[PDB]
Symmetry: none
């Protein structure tokens, strides 16, 4: 599990976080970033100590200080920030700390050595400025694609520590969906209600496979590659309309996703998938507490002694904000050359016209960059 | 421009169109119909005017209204709808216009005089019916062999004009390939990857020739005749495995294809050719814009004043859907086609290019 263990553990932890998010929003659209939560929490590990540090290490499965962990995360980061990503994915991590706090000696440089980033310093007593700083951080490192943060409203004058994670993603498919084949079509919600939404259609040999839940339900997993085959999007949905998405959601796992990839076969199919555009701001507290990280959020219980001695010190706010667009090209600014509407006879069809799960993965490392549930596109 | 010419100009325009298709799908299978697209665009000529009409005429090289052009296309059509075609080839053209539109007086009859068909009228406000109408048209004139159209997805309530062209082709060889010699065999993709696909084999004296691209690459052309010698399929591919198919594809022309035919010699060989079944639906807009026909697709620029006066009038959609089946029956020196090849189906009497395509993976 040679330093690629970190990508795995990382992903694995992110998925567990996502599950809590999904169980709290059954029926609502949710896009999340497993990779991102792990990354910002790994940074957070350095500022902690005591039982607070223990909960995070126990929940993540690793220690950011052990030989090879930090370097593997840096490597992983560099690997996704490569040349192949044509402005398709942006990601930031940021820990804001009250400016006056006296930090422990060696904290700053130790942090920088392992991440090549700094804990940000802000004057929380000046709250609108504080709030503006935090939002602007996010805006400037995600090319202005993330709408402003809404949870920062709880940032007051007693705020001493805030952490944020934000990512934007709009990939360019290996094979773009043809514009002319995008049409209206009924989407069956979970209500039993219906809505007519633009769905894209494409015929192609698709990596595909069918799994069974631990209690006998059949689900289909389709893999859609992005340009270059670095990243791909996995679409997963229950065979039977009656089965609710939670059937899949509750058994999800980073390992399970690798298993889907491994058993797939390229088969000709006509794919009908809804266009969709999700944005989700997640308040990380509940999900973190459900994973056992309770001390970090409680004042006077939280041990953040690796960052500072100033007594009251805890996470006042932990947010993740993600936006993911799924359209035909992934670039209408440089309108494709695409001319072929259909390239082959496609008998068997796959119509994603009921709530589905989507996974965006970095194939080389098996890192789950995004994971979401579309309940209504 | 007189009439034996129309088959040529027609074929030549279709080949330019196909070249745009292949340039945009380098590496993907593609079956196209040069004759098909010329025919439906020739029909479209009548509904246009202004600079829209000019772009079509400049790119096709002829005017459907000049003395003898229509008559020749009609003849050409009848000549391939003959008795010799034993349910091997089906083709349709169809221009669908919004029912409510007030058509200019004399448009309809002038159209029917020159084509012996009518512009179809549909209620585009009722979009699934519309889509159904367009699909079913194609389904009834192609003996049900063409899978439904996916490009009609863009037909909405504002659609006023759509054009389609669909062809099905499964010919019966002059000399069937024997079943028992069809075996598996490695086909070398362009990737470098490999695949095992049913290849057919036959020994015979085959019309064959060899040409050089304008930059020195040798390519072999093989001629496979269909029953009666009316039509034949030309198989073309580079001598050297390293040369990509586009080296041939970018220099192709209707004239070139007539040249291959004229320099061929019947020589005994053992031909090994992959069995293949292609279907491709093409969105003609890009290819047509690249050939200079940009106005017909733009709202409020497009001049379709010979069909009607109702202001917003333009081509919302232009599709071609083609399927071709190449099997054994249709019901010393070796030539092993085990790397991407180009195929051309030609009507020999007129030298019309009915089908043209590239098989990157069979």
């Amino acid at each position: 599990h040679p330093p690629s263990y970190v990508a795995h553990l990382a992903s694995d932890f992110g998925v567990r976080v996502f599950q809590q998010v999904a169980q709290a929003s059954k029926d609502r659209n949710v896009v999340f970033s497993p990779y991102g939560v792990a990354s910002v929490l790994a940074m957070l590990q350095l500022t902690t100590g005591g039982e607070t540090q223990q909960q995070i290490q126990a929940a993540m499965g690793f220690k950011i200080d052990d030989k090879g962990m930090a370097p593997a995360l840096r490597h992983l980061y560099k690997e996704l920030m490569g040349p192949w990503n044509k402005d398709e994915i942006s990601t930031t991590d940021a820990i804001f700390v009250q400016r006056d706090l006296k930090l422990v000696q060696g904290f700053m440089p130790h942090f920088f050595r392992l991440f090549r980033s700094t804990v940000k310093q802000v004057d929380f007593s000046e709250v609108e400025r504080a709030r503006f700083i935090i939002n602007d951080w996010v805006k400037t490192h995600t090319k202005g694609m993330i709408s402003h943060l809404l949870g920062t409203g709880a940032v007051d004058q007693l705020t001493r520590l805030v952490l944020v994670n934000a990512l934007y993603f709009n990939g360019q498919w290996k094979t773009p969906f043809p514009d002319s084949s995008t049409h209206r079509r009924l989407f069956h919600k979970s209500d039993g209600s219906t809505v007519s939404v633009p769905m894209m259609a494409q015929t192609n040999k698709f990596n595909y496979t069918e799994f069974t839940t631990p209690d006998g339900h059949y689900y289909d997993i389709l893999e859609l590659p992005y340009h270059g085959d670095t990243l791909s999007m996995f679409i997963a949905a229950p065979y039977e309309k009656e089965v609710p998405l939670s059937a899949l959601t509750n058994i999800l796992s980073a390992q399970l996703i690798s298993h889907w990839k491994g058993n797939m076969t390229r088969l000709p199919r006509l794919l009908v998938l809804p266009k969709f555009s999700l944005e989700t701001e997640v308040d990380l507290r509940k999900p973190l507490e459900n994973l056992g990280m309770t001390d970090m959020f409680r004042p006077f219980q939280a041990d953040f002694t690796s960052l500072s001695d100033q007594e009251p010190l805890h996470v006042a706010l932990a947010l993740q904000k993600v936006k993911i667009e799924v359209n035909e090209s992934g670039t209408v600014a440089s309108s494709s050359t695409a001319v072929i509407v259909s390239a082959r006879m496609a008998p068997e069809e796959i119509i994603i016209d009921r709530p589905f799960l989507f996974v965006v993965r970095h194939n080389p490392t098996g890192t789950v960059l995004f994971m979401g549930q579309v309940m209504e596109p």
